[PDB]
Amino acid sequence: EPHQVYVQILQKLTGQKATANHAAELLAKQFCTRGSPQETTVLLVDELDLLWTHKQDIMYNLFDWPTHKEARLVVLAIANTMDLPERIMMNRVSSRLGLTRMCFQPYTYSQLQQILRSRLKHLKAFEDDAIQLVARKVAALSGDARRCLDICRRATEICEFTIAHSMEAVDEMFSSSYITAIKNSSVLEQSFLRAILAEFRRSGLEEATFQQIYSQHVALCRMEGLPYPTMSETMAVCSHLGSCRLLLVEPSRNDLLLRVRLNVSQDDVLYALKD
Amino acid sequence: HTECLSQVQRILRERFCRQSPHSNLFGVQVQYKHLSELLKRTALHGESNSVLIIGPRGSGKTMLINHALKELMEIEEVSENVLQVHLNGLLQINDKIALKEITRQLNLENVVGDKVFGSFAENLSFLPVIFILDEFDLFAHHKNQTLLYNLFDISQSAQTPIAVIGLTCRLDILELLEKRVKSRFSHRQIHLMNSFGFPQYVKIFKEQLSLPAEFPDKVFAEKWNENVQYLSEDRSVQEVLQKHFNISKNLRSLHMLLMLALNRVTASHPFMTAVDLMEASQLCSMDSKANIVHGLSVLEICLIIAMKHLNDIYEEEPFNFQMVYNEFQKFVQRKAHSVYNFEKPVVMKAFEHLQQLELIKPMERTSGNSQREYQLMKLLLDNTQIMNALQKYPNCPTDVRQWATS
Amino acid sequence: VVLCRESQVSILQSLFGERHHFSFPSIFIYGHTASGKTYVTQTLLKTLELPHVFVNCVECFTLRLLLEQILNKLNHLSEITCETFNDFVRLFKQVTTAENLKDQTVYIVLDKAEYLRDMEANLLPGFLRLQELADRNVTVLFLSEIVWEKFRPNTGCFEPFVLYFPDYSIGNLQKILSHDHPPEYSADFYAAYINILLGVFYTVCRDLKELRHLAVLNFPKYCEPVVKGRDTRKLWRNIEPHLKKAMQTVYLRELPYYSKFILIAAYLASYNPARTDKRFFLKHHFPLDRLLAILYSIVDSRVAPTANIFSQITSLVTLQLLTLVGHDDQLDGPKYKCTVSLDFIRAIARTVNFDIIKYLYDFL
Amino acid sequence: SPPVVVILKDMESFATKVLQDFIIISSQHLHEFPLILIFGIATSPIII
Numbered sequence A: 001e002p003h004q005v006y007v008q009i010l011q012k013l014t015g016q017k018a019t020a021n022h023a024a025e026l027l028a029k030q031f032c033t034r035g036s037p038q039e040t041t042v043l044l045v046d047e048l049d050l051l052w053t054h055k056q057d058i059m060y061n062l063f064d065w066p067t068h069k070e071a072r073l074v075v076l077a078i079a080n081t082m083d084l085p086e087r088i089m090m091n092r093v094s095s096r097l098g099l100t101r102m103c104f105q106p107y108t109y110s111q112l113q114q115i116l117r118s119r120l121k122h123l124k125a126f127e128d129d130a131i132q133l134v135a136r137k138v139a140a141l142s143g144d145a146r147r148c149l150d151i152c153r154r155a156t157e158i159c160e161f162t163i164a165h166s167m168e169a170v171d172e173m174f175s176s177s178y179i180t181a182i183k184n185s186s187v188l189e190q191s192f193l194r195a196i197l198a199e200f201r202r203s204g205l206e207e208a209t210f211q212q213i214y215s216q217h218v219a220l221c222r223m224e225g226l227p228y229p230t231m232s233e234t235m236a237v238c239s240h241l242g243s244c245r246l247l248l249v250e251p252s253r254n255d256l257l258l259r260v261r262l263n264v265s266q267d268d269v270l271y272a273l274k275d
Numbered sequence B: 001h002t003e004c005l006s007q008v009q010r011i012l013r014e015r016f017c018r019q020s021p022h023s024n025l026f027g028v029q030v031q032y033k034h035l036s037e038l039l040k041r042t043a044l045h046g047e048s049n050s051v052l053i054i055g056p057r058g059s060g061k062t063m064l065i066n067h068a069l070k071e072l073m074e075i076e077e078v079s080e081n082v083l084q085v086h087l088n089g090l091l092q093i094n095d096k097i098a099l100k101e102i103t104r105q106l107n108l109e110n111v112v113g114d115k116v117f118g119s120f121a122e123n124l125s126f127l128p129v130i131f132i133l134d135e136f137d138l139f140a141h142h143k144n145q146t147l148l149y150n151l152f153d154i155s156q157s158a159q160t161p162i163a164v165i166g167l168t169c170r171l172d173i174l175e176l177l178e179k180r181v182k183s184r185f186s187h188r189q190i191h192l193m194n195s196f197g198f199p200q201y202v203k204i205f206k207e208q209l210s211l212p213a214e215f216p217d218k219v220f221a222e223k224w225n226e227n228v229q230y231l232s233e234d235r236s237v238q239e240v241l242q243k244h245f246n247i248s249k250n251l252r253s254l255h256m257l258l259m260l261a262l263n264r265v266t267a268s269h270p271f272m273t274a275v276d277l278m279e280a281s282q283l284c285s286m287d288s289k290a291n292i293v294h295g296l297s298v299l300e301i302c303l304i305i306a307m308k309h310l311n312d313i314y315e316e317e318p319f320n321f322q323m324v325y326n327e328f329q330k331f332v333q334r335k336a337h338s339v340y341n342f343e344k345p346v347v348m349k350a351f352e353h354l355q356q357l358e359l360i361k362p363m364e365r366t367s368g369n370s371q372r373e374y375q376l377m378k379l380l381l382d383n384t385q386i387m388n389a390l391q392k393y394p395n396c397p398t399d400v401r402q403w404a405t406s
Numbered sequence C: 001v002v003l004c005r006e007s008q009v010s011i012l013q014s015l016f017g018e019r020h021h022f023s024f025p026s027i028f029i030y031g032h033t034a035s036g037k038t039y040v041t042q043t044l045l046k047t048l049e050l051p052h053v054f055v056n057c058v059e060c061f062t063l064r065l066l067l068e069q070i071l072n073k074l075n076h077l078s079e080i081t082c083e084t085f086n087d088f089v090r091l092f093k094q095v096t097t098a099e100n101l102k103d104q105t106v107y108i109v110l111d112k113a114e115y116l117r118d119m120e121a122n123l124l125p126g127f128l129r130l131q132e133l134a135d136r137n138v139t140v141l142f143l144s145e146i147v148w149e150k151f152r153p154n155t156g157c158f159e160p161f162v163l164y165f166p167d168y169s170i171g172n173l174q175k176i177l178s179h180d181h182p183p184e185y186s187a188d189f190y191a192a193y194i195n196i197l198l199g200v201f202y203t204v205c206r207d208l209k210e211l212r213h214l215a216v217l218n219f220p221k222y223c224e225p226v227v228k229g230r231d232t233r234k235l236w237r238n239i240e241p242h243l244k245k246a247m248q249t250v251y252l253r254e255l256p257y258y259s260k261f262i263l264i265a266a267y268l269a270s271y272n273p274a275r276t277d278k279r280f281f282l283k284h285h286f287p288l289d290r291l292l293a294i295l296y297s298i299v300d301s302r303v304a305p306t307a308n309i310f311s312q313i314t315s316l317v318t319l320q321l322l323t324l325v326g327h328d329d330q331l332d333g334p335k336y337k338c339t340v341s342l343d344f345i346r347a348i349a350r351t352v353n354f355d356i357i358k359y360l361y362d363f364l
Numbered sequence D: 001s002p003p004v005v006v007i008l009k010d011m012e013s014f015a016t017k018v019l020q021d022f023i024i025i026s027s028q029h030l031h032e033f034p035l036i037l038i039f040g041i042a043t044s045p046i047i048i
């Protein structure tokens, strides 16, 4: 709970157990009254944006208490959004955190290469080309060291089984599996997808009822020579397709009047179905 | 004789209904090898990993994990150090319940405490244990995903080794996670697809209905193997299998069909027949709507025909009771002296009964302001379905049939 | 006893097998209203002498009541109170370890399951896969009139075995109705009664319960003529008009003065478009003010706006003859609708000597 | 063994759903305890 942070800080400094409101009151009394001279308090709060409240009392107290001379409190707030003190924080506290905003830019590919070299000092295990390509992909995608380490570990694992290892890692841990899932789909599911595409081309809309899709599927099956499908079979296939989040449907109560929306781009479907 | 039939019935019922573990694995050699290798790495060392397994429901997601655990737990005394926790998204719907289950499974309630106190630092401060998360997608729908974030954090920490395993049917599980947990999630994914052809499905069917080598009677087992092998190439059995394979490749439906086929095995017919498989397939592939229509009465049939006429004249528009009554009156008035002299209340009760069977659904539901009359109703059937059902109606009169044709 | 029900009984007996054997995790039974699902299933369970718990979904309108009733009845077969599904599963595992519950299949009979989809989202998936979670040889049965197509959750779950109970026929109904003949007369007498009754009412009423109720009600008048003194023609001629009178009700089994004027004015306001109001009332060529103007126009005598007419309006609202549409706090622009049938307003108009048809725009 | 008598004064204002629920629940427990209903209707009996 958000209000429980008052209990956590109090228990960390004195070990006392109290209610959220009483812990807040005791912390207020300690930080507003001239008590015994205590050591300077270094407070670190992680994931600030998740402490938000409609009343903004906790945030106001957190960023207002060090303003008091008697507090002897230094607070560092780590967050991901730089807009927070502007559009999330009100004016008086925004001016309190104003002009003290540190922004950490993402590592350049040179920085990533330096980090990787420091990780692998005195160890000749990777070729420079794989390292440079991995750092460059990381720079061009997110510039994150965590996924870089994951890619390096996967490359080591594949080498246990060169640039090929890094390419396999990057195109296996980043690329989407929709195309291969469509490729491994059944024949009836492919016919259903073709019927949906044909109906969409005829109409031009991105939403279609189940009845027209069923009619198009029946026409396609007649063209293909497939046996006549029942309504229950088509509904079961559609329900299975919606289960893996390839479509969008609410078939709990509506059966013949179900709106269907594609979860993937039309061109990807065409490129998967041409083969 | 009877004892052998009872034993084989018990064994096959245990195989299908309870889904008992079996050494046979189909098209999952690489995936199982990878999963077992990573489990051994996580067990023999202090390293931590996180893996998600994606596949359609009924594709043996749990079987891979169970077989790997049975293979690797009994390797050495590591299982004594290894602890396992199983969590299902259906039973545990709240974080408090999940925490309570975690505490009770670890037998730490004495250490942590018995009361309902919300503090969890007793475990957190103290925190090799493996975690199994059934229906992992449901946990992502919690208010703050606190449990998942804490599990990922402790997996990424250097305090204790923790293995996290999740099961998901959705293919978009990556976008259901928040940015922080997605960044902290080790991108290890295994995909379970039925990547095999129809002949491989035939082989699977042949092997599944094969008696094990541990059966007491050996000559009877060999004769059963001969029977199933002979039934394998029969073109009617192949046609039924082809139909069911076109419908769906999931093994759960195949297990259900095999179970229903075995139900018709008696003393007089110890060995199956292709006609038994045909009967089972026919019973498994019937539409419910036509069955519901078949059990109606004459007045309901006339009302449905009037409804179809309304849908034809007014293309894809709602209706109420008054218009249907008026046109039924028109039909009974054109005929000279047909025996259909019925009053309003009985027709109203018939309409209420039809609405009760949920063949007709209201639009933009409201009550009090609008009565049952003058209420926008729609039909949930197709014209071809009505024609096919009326064709098989036992005693449909000529007059109503010709009205339907009109 | 069950008549003309032998295929489903044999199928269920084969499915059950032996007591120590396992069975399906979920079986879904569907049928018509008078199919006899409860009768057949409960008679079969009683005959086989199996451990079964009979539960009504309507009575257990809350999850706690459902789980506590199930557990208490199971314990009685072998106080316990539970609140959550996981606690219910744990206690069920604890309670099923009885010697009488060791090597036997546990059956949980649920009827009127149409309400289960409106109780909780995850309750049905939990019930469907109970045998996997408990692993204690447990089977759950379903009785409903709605097909399985509407019971499927969005995420998909373990598919139950679907079963259908066959619909009845003329011979089947005649056998069932003629089985319980009165001992005071010949079987052929009651058979002829059932024959004529079926020949009259099978066209509309196929409900076994309702037709049997009609036979029970009408039998004494069937047997009066013979008491008064095997004459088929005599019986049919004496009894025919009573049958026609009975068929008039198959399924069926004085306002104050100013109230009538209020009612007819409300009907006119509801069923007449506003554009034609002056065309019907202005001497030369819905909100409350329109009603007041129409009422003032209709009544030949000058009526004072006494509070009693407002009390009449409110009472008519209470009697569900006039429905309030607008907000309750808005009692300065209220909206009303009339829910009176046309035959009723014509009948009440006749007692007043007023011709409402001459003013109805739709008829003109 | 005396029965139990329940009086419903103004059923026009009663919601239907509670009425059907009470009727269906009480039907299955008539053997447990007798129950008799008395209806007071201001309008014509057709309203039932």
Ligand SMILES: Nc1ncnc2c1ncn2[C@@H]1O[C@H](COP(=O)(O)OP(=O)(O)OP(O)(O)=S)[C@@H](O)[C@H]1O
Binding pocket: B019, B024, B025, B026, B027, B028, B056, B057, B058, B059, B060, B061, B062, B063, B167, B169, B251, B252, B255
């Ligand atoms: N590769 C496989 N090897 C052996 N059996 C398999 C395999 N794939 C599927 N099966 C069988 O498929 C049947 C249905 O799978 P289930 O175990 O019911 O699905 P699941 O693993 O429980 O996944 P969910 O999402 O939890 S329902 C079981 O009897 C499995 O034995």
Ligand SMILES: Nc1ncnc2c1ncn2[C@@H]1O[C@H](COP(=O)(O)OP(=O)(O)OP(O)(O)=S)[C@@H](O)[C@H]1O
Binding pocket: C001, C002, C003, C004, C005, C031, C032, C033, C034, C035, C036, C037, C038, C039, C040, C111, C112, C143, C176, C208, C209
């Ligand atoms: N096959 C049958 N053989 C003998 N009597 C039957 C048969 N089917 C129905 N009955 C009788 O008809 C009565 C009414 O049937 P029900 O059991 O109420 O129907 P139902 O299928 O259970 O539908 P619900 O669930 O009650 S709405 C039963 O109480 C029996 O007395």
Ligand SMILES: [Mg+2]
Binding pocket: B061, B062
């Ligand atoms: Mg499973």
Ligand SMILES: [Mg+2]
Binding pocket: C036, C037, C038, C039, C111
């Ligand atoms: Mg019943």
